């Protein structure tokens, strides 16, 4: 089947963060701070002459308590972030979840028509991890387990499973035409997955937090904060490099402001960026 | 290492059901119906000279929509059922869940001080199965998986996990002094577990639905309705027989009125039975 | 590439409680009914090349099994296969869905045929028979042997020594256009079903994984089986996907409804004969 | 200690055989032939003061075509072999099968009251191997598979399974009081097992054909003919040496005339040997 | 029936950023500090008698590794062992927690010592070193080799050939009262920790699974490591359980706090020395 | 679309008991015979692509091993490869069937070649070497080291760090038309054989899983091996299936019968040269 997809990376928030957090405890230690985007990626396309899908890789978090747990700024609603590219949250039929951290699957219920795809190992891993954490007597002992995980997202996932809106992927699978989910077990998280997007202009990768920063995969240096196996990430980087033949601009990192320096980018009134990574044959640009 | 436990099996409801359902196709086919008890079991004890635990194996379902999906009668609140043996739901500190069928974990939020114990395979099995079933285009194609399973219990399970009130068992484990949980993978359900209870009068077994009826384990004949592997149940029957040295009255089946005929039993006003299976050193009977 | 013509032939009939085949809930206490005992003949293979004459299963012999259960109208392979223009000597390969007596019993009646069975089926029954002899009484073994003849374990071993039995381990395209599919712990330890590719699309020989169309149409496994009910659910879905929900393309094991869904002749006696596919020039063997 | 066993190794036949077969292709190539005993081992005992079991480790082959496929001589019936130590074949309640080669299980039906214990992997291994062999067009291509295996023993085993005479062991198991079966997967054969026998004078090992000759385990040099994994045999030798704390005479090899030099031995009229390896407490010697 | 004398000796020091050892987030952009390089001497065994001289880890040689990091105060083993009454050649056994340069580099300075290391540790590094060489530039290889010397792969092989090294595969009580604990994919592919059963309770040589006491106390894996963050969390719980949450009975890899909570006395260059347990019938040391 | 020229080059000869190579049963007490020591030259790859020059195995050096067995006629890689128009410097790839001394001992004579080994072979020998040193005497270690030199373990680790050795894990097409097939616990822990696809059909470099044509023709594994005899049986079946029972298409490890099945000529000292295949557009010798 021939597939083609338009791809936009949309900032919906910003975080000021220690560099070693994203870039590595070695190379980026004691290197000050910087602003990094909170991003989700819109994909529109599919089989040519077939159903057109409106897909989000990840969907941001909500305007809730998480805004106080880190140095966030410039948060924007899905109505506004997607409106600037000519869509609405109602139009989104699928959310592909790289991992169940709060900033990639929180707020999925703002897309009432979307089905959620999660790796089974991600869901089961977090169920066990959350349950195990309650053997510690204080919350200080639980802090690391919950640094990026909202137990309420466990409840929402179960609610979606029973509702029929959450679907499990187990391993690798072409879930939409030209989008292949790749399980990276115990990489960034228990069941992090990345996505291979095949377009007429070649492959693109939505890496999730497996690749926080381009420097992670270019320097082969896993981040200072992650909740998996650093050597597994090494293995995944090599898989990703092979898919895109080291055309590093084709990989979408999770939280790297460097992405705006590498693609046709314009900014919204508040500053949040929009990137036009690719346009399928016959589509028009969204720059004002 | 010296454990001792008092054991009461208490009926909270009754169901009229075709016999082959519980007893088996072929041998009990076209045998009409009979009343069968809906049961949970109270265990009080632990290490002699130690903390006396108050534990439930299973806790029944709520008087909700489930009362109409089967021929139930005489449903009773846990306050009424445990009161007859001298306890209240607030006393229950542990609920041992044999499996996640609605009638064994439905009403657990009625015991606000209790921790829930479930096999990881039971929880993960149902998460996968519920999700897989929503790939069917019609609701009729989904009936069989949900005949005994309430997706609302999946949600309550997830809520208790994050609350810290639900704990996973993975395999065999002595979770309380003298009570060891036994994983029976893919027997009655994905992660059914049974419980071995060690007292001064020897072992007792809480079997759950692996053994619906004594005849399941006496005739080695699995039921006409189950959601796991029939030959796995046979193997579990053999383990149970070995633990109990073939003294069958020492096994507590899930839904067999025959239990009231094998132990010291009396009736409540509405009819629900209270079987006293064992009394630990120093306890007086509650007839 | 490949094409095959297909006939399903009865060789006996069985009167059985409906809950046996259809489910303990929905078909309980529904009386009894007549069900065909069937094996399926396939003739063909690759288009320009060796024509194979194949049986899926081969029925049982007229021995003590006629007094077991309640059979009637039993017929010899010489009679059943002659009506379609063949003799028992023509069959070069018999595909065994599982080692229950009525699907592999009479295999020595086809002297030129190689028998194909899943390694897990043979190993499972070897273990199960041996394990059952841990029970001291014959009554405790009844369920293991409800459908299994220990003499067929010996005949199977005799055939292994003869080179007449071949093991399949998992999925395999055995003959041209016929893929065996292992369904581990489905009806039995190593049940397998067969995907048959013709010019008119695919056909499925389901064995007893699907006793009745109602099993797979309602997604409701039978009341009697010796495997895992949820595994059967998974297989039902695999089969539906292969056949694009064109259910008449699935050959159930023991369902009179197949005579209502296909060109079906009838024999001098009651046992039926049903055409399912005729690949170009296979003159219909319909009178 | 609460268990005790008397132990006799009894030769029932003799075989003239090339030395490299039993001792190894390195040291014993082109080294001629020698006479080697065909042996099964009688164990009498159990719980001290409780049931006196009568046990055979292996039971030899029958007087059939096998007598011509090798240089056999002096085959003797179980009535005569066991008669010399004061027992009859009807006394044997248990036959422990090291492996299903013809000379270790061929004759089990001459012991009408005995249950056979066989490793599940041994039975399934031979079932597969026999069935696979019939893909070869000539009987010569099957010859190695059948050098020590009789397909008729497959049928007899299936018959014993159906009768309730055959019991499967899967892995390690204390089968009788003081006798533990040890699975040695893929050693001499698919499911070879050896037996540790606890006596008041310490442990004895019935090695089956894992140890043909003392030299295999003393020199750590597996034989030239076997149907398993040579390095697996190396690993089992180490387990055996450790159990007997390097008392090599406590190990009963399958086919070594050297055993008559290491134990109190006398001979029958035809030359077949009797070795009294151990006499449990209270037991009297059987030497004439 | 089993007793052990236990000494933790600092053979060197490093000035390192805090998030490296303590964790990103709670120690991000928090500056740096001096941290010790230690190996742990245990001598004793079955109270019956046979006394073994065992080292947990054995430092790194004084070579190019001294310039790769803010090292100082590197001392010889004969120097450091002498201050507690021993000579390298006395060591019977070197228990290797993992194959990073600074726990395995100088094992040849102990000609009598058998080396015990996990099969997965050795096998994982063989795999990794080989995998890295499909990277064309040296910058891409940097992280794999931050703590690993390819020359230690060649020594290990030479040790295998010589009979100096033996592979553990799983848990195994390697010497009377010392249980080796496989922690697959913790700090490294096959890191392991050791559970020393002394008459005065239990002791844990943590290796680099626990860089700092605060990794286990704050349940917070470090910012640099080369295995599985959640696996470390689960080993933290296995350790906490073995010592009943008495954290001092765990010896971290590179925490100067260990000097603070155990009898310590500086040496000439300052490299500390702490005695954690002297087996009754054993003589102390300054 | 692949094509390869194939030469089997004897670089040495060994006088050995027949049962060693042929079997403890059939060839017992059968005396000895001369057997070739062989490595195979492969030149080709994808048609229209980078033509590779590859060695399957590379022999051992003229060192202590020349005295550990009845060897004769040892020749250098410079001489043996010189006769077919190449030098050791041309070989960029050596595919190693197993780590026995006579198949990897001399790989450093090929300074530009990458070495490919099964991971299970390397870890297998690493473990076995360590386990062997638990025995207190050297006679108890002899069988483990009959064909294995611990110096090759050290040379292997050095190449690992140097970047010259690569691990294969299971089956893999390493070069165009060459598939490595792991045969776990066959001749050794991680023995591998190679399927070579040419325009004239498939050829197999069997290593020592097949010492002699009679192993696979008689389905009778050898009297000396360090793996699992029934695994070799199953591997024999895979090989026979690939070549559709054309046994001359299988390259055995040590069988002089090979010179009788192909265009063969001899060197001055006696060592044989076998031209098994010439890819489209090639001239003989
Ligand atoms: Zn994240
Ligand atoms: Zn993120
Ligand atoms: Zn139930
Ligand atoms: Zn129930
Ligand atoms: Zn059936
Ligand atoms: Zn049937
Ligand atoms: Zn044998
Ligand atoms: Zn033998
Ligand atoms: Zn370190
Ligand atoms: Zn380290
Ligand atoms: Zn070799
Ligand atoms: Zn060789």
- Least CA distance to E160: which residue of chain F? F130
Residues of chain C neighbouring D152 (CB-CB closer than 8 A): 161
3-class DSSP state of C218: coil
b/e sequence B167-200, b meaning 16+ C-beta within 10 Å: bbbeeeeebbbbbbbbbbbbbbbbbbbbbbbbbe
- Both tokens assigned to C22: 């259809």
Contact D154, D130 (CB under 8 A): yes
Best interface-test mutation with B: which of C24, C236, C240 has the largest number of B CBs within 10 A? C24
User: d(Cα E178, Cα E194) in Å, to the nearest integer?
Assistant: 6
Tell me if residue D11 falls in helix, strand or coil. Answer: strand
Angle ∠(C68,C70,C73) on CA atoms, nearest 5: 115
The rounded distance, in Å, linking the Cα atoms of F97 and F115 is: 11
Tell me which chain A residues have a C-beta less than 8 angstroms from the C-beta of E143: 24, 26, 219-222, 234
Bridge pairing between strands E165-168 and E114-118: parallel
| Neighboring chain B residues of A120 at a CB cutoff of 8 Å | 128
Are chains B and A in contact at 3+ CB pairs closer than 8 Å?
yes
Residue of A207, C16, F223, D279 lying closest to B29 (CA atoms) = C16
The answer, yes or no, to whether B and D have at least 3 beta-carbon pairs within 8 Å is no
E contact chains, 3+ CB pairs < 8 A: A, F
**Beta-carbon count within 10 A of B228 CB:** 28
Give the separation between CA F127 and CA A219, rounded to whole angstroms.
34
Q: Output the DSSP codes for A219-263.
A: TT---SS-SSBHHHHHHHHHHHHHHTTT-GGGEE-SS-GGGGGSS
Q: What is the DSSP string of chain B?
A: --EEEEEEEEEEEEEEEEHHHHH-TTTTTT--EEEEEEEEEEEEEEETTS--EEEEE-----SSGGGGTTEEE----HHHHHHTTT--GGG--EEE-S--SHHHHGGGGG-TTPEEEEEHHHHHHHHHHHHHHTTSSSSGGGTTTTSS--HHHHHHHHHHHHHT-EEEE-S-EEEETTEEEEEEETSSSTEEEEEEEEETTEEEEEEEGGGSSHHHHHTT---SS-SSBHHHHHHHHHHHHHHTTT-GGGEEESS-GGGGGTSEEEE-TTS-EEEEEE--TTPPP--
Q: Where are the domains of chain A?
A: 3-278
Residue holding tokens 């198991």?
D173
DSSP for residue F46: E
Q: Which residues on chain C are in Cβ contact (under 8 Å) with D102?
A: none
Q: How far apart are CA B212 and CA B202, in angstroms?
A: 23
The DSSP output letter for D21 is H
- Choose which CATH entry (3.30.750.24, 3.90.650.10, 3.60.15.10, 3.40.50.720) describes domain E2-277: 3.60.15.10
Question: To the nearest whole angstrom, how far is the Cα of B212 from the nearest Cα of chain A?
Answer: 28
D137: number of Cβ within 10 Å: 9
Q: In whole angstroms, what is the distance from residue E7 CA to residue D125 CA?
A: 54
Contact exists between E and F (3 or more beta carbon pairs < 8 Å): yes
Query: What is the D29 CA–ligand 8 centroid distance (Å)?
Result: 20
According to DSSP, residue F53 is labeled E
The order of strands in the sheet holding C178-182 is C172-173, C178-182, C192-198, C201-205, C250-251
Q: Are B192 and B98 in contact (CB under 8 A)?
A: yes
Which among A134, A151, A168 is the nearest to B128, CB-wise? A168
Hey, are the CB atoms on E166 and F130 less than 8 Å from each other? yes
Q: Ligand 6 centroid to C56 CA: how many Å?
A: 12
- Rounded Cα gap, residues B111 and C174, in angstroms: 58
Cβ <8 Å between E160 and F129 = yes
- Cα–Cα distance list, E33 to A91, C27, C57, E19 (Å): 54, 76, 77, 10
Rounded Cα distance between A160 and C9, Å, is 48
3 state SS of E90: helix
List CB contacts of C230: < 8 A, sequence separation 6 or more: B129, B145, B186, B190, B227, B228
Vertex B82, ends B76 and B83: CA angle to 5°? 95
Of C144, C161, C169, give the one whose Cα is nearest residue C224: C144
Q: From the centroid of its chain, how far is CA A118? A: 12
Sign, CA torsion C145/C150/C152/C156: positive
Residue of A nearest to E234 (CA): A132
Which ligand places an atom closest to the C-alpha of E225? 10
From CA E55, how far away is CA B203, in angstroms rounded? 49
Q: How many residues appear in chain B?
A: 287
> Which chain E residues contact residue A145 at CB under 8 A?
219, 233
Question: DSSP letter string over C26-66?
Answer: TTTT--EEEEEEEEEEEEEEETTS--EEEEE-----SSGGG
Chain F contacts of E154, Cβ < 8 Å?
Answer: 154, 157-158, 161
Whether there are 3 or more C-beta pairs closer than 8 Å between F and A is no
Q: Is the dihedral of CA D238, D239, D242, D246 positive or negative?
A: negative
User: Which of 3.30.70.20, 3.60.15.10, 3.90.470.20, 3.40.367.20 is the CATH number of B3-278?
Assistant: 3.60.15.10
Mind telling me how many Å the CA of D93 is from chain F's nearest CA?
33
Q: How far from the centroid of its chain's Cα atoms is residue F184's Cα?
A: 16
Other beta carbons within 10 Å of F64: 11
CB contact under 8 A, B162 and A168: no
Output the CA angle E235-E237-E239, nearest 5 degrees: 70
What residue in C sits closest to B226 (Cα-Cα)? C229
Cβ distance C198 to C2 under 8 Å? yes
Of F251, F245, F240, F241, the residue nearest F276 (C-alpha): F251
Sign of CA dihedral B235, B240, B245, B247: negative
Using CA of residue F85, residue F89, residue F93, residue F94, what is the dihedral sign?
positive
Using CA coordinates, name the residue in chain F closest to D185: F228
The DSSP string of chain A is: --EEEEEEEEEEEEEEEEHHHHH-TTTTTT--EEEEEEEEEEEEEEETTSPPEEEEE-----SSGGGGTTTEE----HHHHHHTTT--GGG--EEE-S--SHHHHTTGGG-TTPEEEEEHHHHHHHHHHHHHHTTSSSSGGGTTTTSS--HHHHHHHHHHHHHT-EEEE-SSEEEETTEEEEE-TTSSSTT-EEEEEEETTEEEEE-GGGGSSHHHHHTT---SS-SSBHHHHHHHHHHHHHHTTT-GGGEE-SS-GGGGGSSEEEE-TTS-EEEEEE--TT------
- DSSP 8-state secondary structure symbol assigned to residue F258: G
Cβ neighbours of residue F207 under 8 Å, at least 6 residues apart? F56, F57, F97, F98, F103, F187, F191, F192, F193, F253
Show the tokens assigned to C6: 């297909």
CA–centroid distance, residue B226 to ligand 4 (Å): 10
- Identify which ligand lies nearest to the alpha carbon of C98: 5
CA distance C36 to chain B (A): 18
Reduced to 3 states, what is the DSSP secondary structure of residue C259?
helix
| Partners of residue B136 in chain A, C-beta under 8 Å | none
The Cα-based distances of A28 to A19, A21, A221, F128 in angstroms read 6, 8, 10, 43
Q: DSSP secondary structure string, E98-114?
A: --SHHHHTTGGG-TTPE
Closest Cβ opposite residue C130 in set D128, D130, D167: D167
Of the candidates A7, A11, A78, A58, which has an alpha carbon nearest to the alpha carbon of residue A273? Answer: A11
Task: Work out whether the CA dihedral B37, B38, B43, B44 comes out positive or negative.
Answer: negative
Tokens 């114990």 map to which residue?
B117
How much distance in Å is there from the Cα of E120 to the middle of ligand 9? 18
What's the rounded Cα separation, in Å, for the pair E42 and C119? 55
For C32, the closest chain B residue by CA position comes to B30
């Amino acid at each position: 089947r021939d597939t083609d997809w338009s791809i936009w990376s949309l900032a919906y928030c910003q975080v000021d963060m220690a560099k070693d957090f994203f870039g590595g405890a070695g190379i980026f230690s004691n290197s000050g701070t910087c602003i990094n985007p909170m991003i989700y990626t819109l994909l529109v396309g599919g089989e040519v002459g077939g159903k057109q899908h409106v897909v989000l890789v990840d969907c941001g978090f909500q305007n809730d308590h998480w805004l106080t747990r880190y140095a966030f700024s410039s948060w924007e609603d899905p109505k506004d972030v997607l409106g600037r590219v000519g869509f609405s949250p109602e139009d989104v039929d699928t959310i592909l979840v790289t991992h169940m951290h709060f900033d990639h699957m929180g707020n999925f219920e703002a897309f009432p028509n979307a089905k959620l795809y999660i790796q089974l190992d991600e869901y089961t891993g977090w169920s066990k991890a959350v349950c195990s954490s309650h053997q510690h007597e204080t919350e200080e002992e639980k802090e690391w387990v919950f640094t990026s995980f909202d137990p309420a997202d466990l409840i929402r996932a179960a609610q979606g499973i029973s509702d029929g809106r959450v679907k499990f992927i187990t391993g690798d699978e072409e879930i939409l035409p030209g989008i292949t989910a790749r399980l990276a077990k115990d990489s960034h998280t228990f069941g992090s997955q990345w996505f291979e997007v095949n377009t007429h202009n070649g492959p693109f990768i939505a890496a999730g937090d497996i690749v926080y920063w381009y420097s992670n995969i270019e320097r082969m240096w896993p981040p200072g904060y992650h909740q998996g196996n650093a050597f597994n990430q090494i293995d995944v980087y090599r898989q990703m490099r092979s898919v895109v033949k080291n055309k590093f601009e084709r990989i979408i990192p999770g939280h790297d402001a460097e992405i705006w320096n590498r693609h046709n980018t314009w900014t919204a009134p508040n500053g949040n960026q929009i990137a036009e990574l690719n346009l399928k044959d016959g589509d028009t640009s969204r720059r004002p």
